[PDB]
């Protein structure tokens, strides 16, 4: 799936850079372009992608400091300059557009829905939001920003693929290492999903999986491959289970309307019975009547299952997240 990335805010520009960097290093070429939009000048200066600074007449290049409503207003006023960065960038070859944002911030939170709603109303391709959910320890302000933002993008975007920061943690890590590690894991997951269509899993399988709308999740897990395909039947079953149950970008995302199961690895090592049974298992676990599947042939000593879940519902993490956010607002209104 050939795509155009637009980061909004600091986290968004960082994740958008990591994804483009993954696509470039591997040579997949799925990312046709990447642009970062922000209101903090310093954030933009460090990024290796095209950058657009907006809002200087309001906040003088120093960000909106977690003010969601200021983040939205600036994107409203300055969207033409944003859209115009995309003129020569959203080419004809684009099969989708990802608006990448941290939902808890001010700029991404405010600007992402605005830009998503603007793009969705003109381009023929799907507009997706790759949205970062704040960790549960983050301040009430960030929970509230994300709550409102998530609600808005879930209506305006064609789908919202969610990344839970709390899902990607390593003991002992520094603050910046943590963020980079999250971005890098997301980049590999999303990049492979985008690359599968470029060869074999048609890009249309991704589109039809996300077509239902609302929240999506992306699962990943891998295992060493034996050269003999028959030895890898268990490996395919278990990576697929892990991808759906533990390795998902949003925790507890099993209950989904649609799914796409991609088994990646060397063709000779991928067993027929493993793949068939793994897909059937996903269908039983999700309850979905729209489980699609395909294989991604690539050089590796391993096998992996990459499972996209579209129309995710009844996720404990999402429900917990919305619950605390509403409690912050209730407490704030007094």
């Amino acid at each position: 799936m050939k795509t155009v990335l637009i980061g909004v805010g600091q986290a968004g520009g960082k994740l958008a850079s990591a994804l483009q960097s993954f696509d470039r290093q591997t040579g997949f070429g799925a990312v046709l372009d990447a642009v970062a939009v922000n209101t903090a000048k310093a954030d933009l200066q460090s990024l290796p992608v095209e950058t657009v600074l907006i809002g200087q007449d309001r906040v003088n290049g120093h960000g909106v400091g977690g003010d969601n409503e200021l983040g939205a207003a600036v994107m409203e006023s300055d969207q033409t300059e944003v859209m115009s960065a995309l003129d020569g960038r959203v080419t004809a070859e684009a099969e989708s557009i990802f608006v990448v944002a941290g939902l808890g911030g001010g700029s991404g939170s405010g600007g992402a829905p605005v830009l998503a709603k603007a793009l969705a109303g003109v381009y023929d391709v799907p507009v997706y939001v790759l949205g970062i959910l704040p960790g549960a320890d983050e301040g009430a302000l960030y929970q509230v920003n994300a709550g409102r933002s998530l609600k808005t993008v879930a209506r305006e975007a064609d789908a919202v693929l969610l990344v839970d920061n709390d899902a990607f943690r390593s003991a002992g890590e520094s603050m910046s290492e943590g963020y980079d590690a999250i971005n890098e894991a997301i980049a590999r997951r999303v990049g492979l999903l985008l690359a599968a269509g470029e060869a074999v899993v048609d890009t249309s399988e991704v589109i039809n999986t996300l077509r239902s709308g609302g929240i999506a999740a992306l699962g990943y897990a891998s295992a060493e491959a034996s050269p003999n395909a028959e030895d890898n039947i268990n490996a395919v079953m278990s990576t697929t289970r892990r991808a759906v149950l533990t390795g998902t970008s949003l925790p507890d995302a099993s209950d989904a309307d649609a799914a796409l199961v991609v088994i990646a690895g060397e063709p000779d090592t991928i067993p027929r019975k493993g793949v068939e049974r793994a897909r059937r298992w996903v269908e039983d676990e999700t309850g979905s009547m729209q489980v699609r599947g395909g294989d991604f042939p690539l050089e590796s000593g391993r096998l992996a299952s990459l499972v996209l879940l579209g129309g995710v519902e009844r996720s404990e993490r999402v429900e917990s997240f919305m619950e605390r956010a509403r409690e912050a607002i209730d407490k704030a209104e007094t």
Partner: peptide, 13 residues
Amino acid sequence: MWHSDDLDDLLGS
């Protein structure tokens, strides 16, 4: 098949 230049496994850890 997508062939890998460089020593890092695409599906590595």
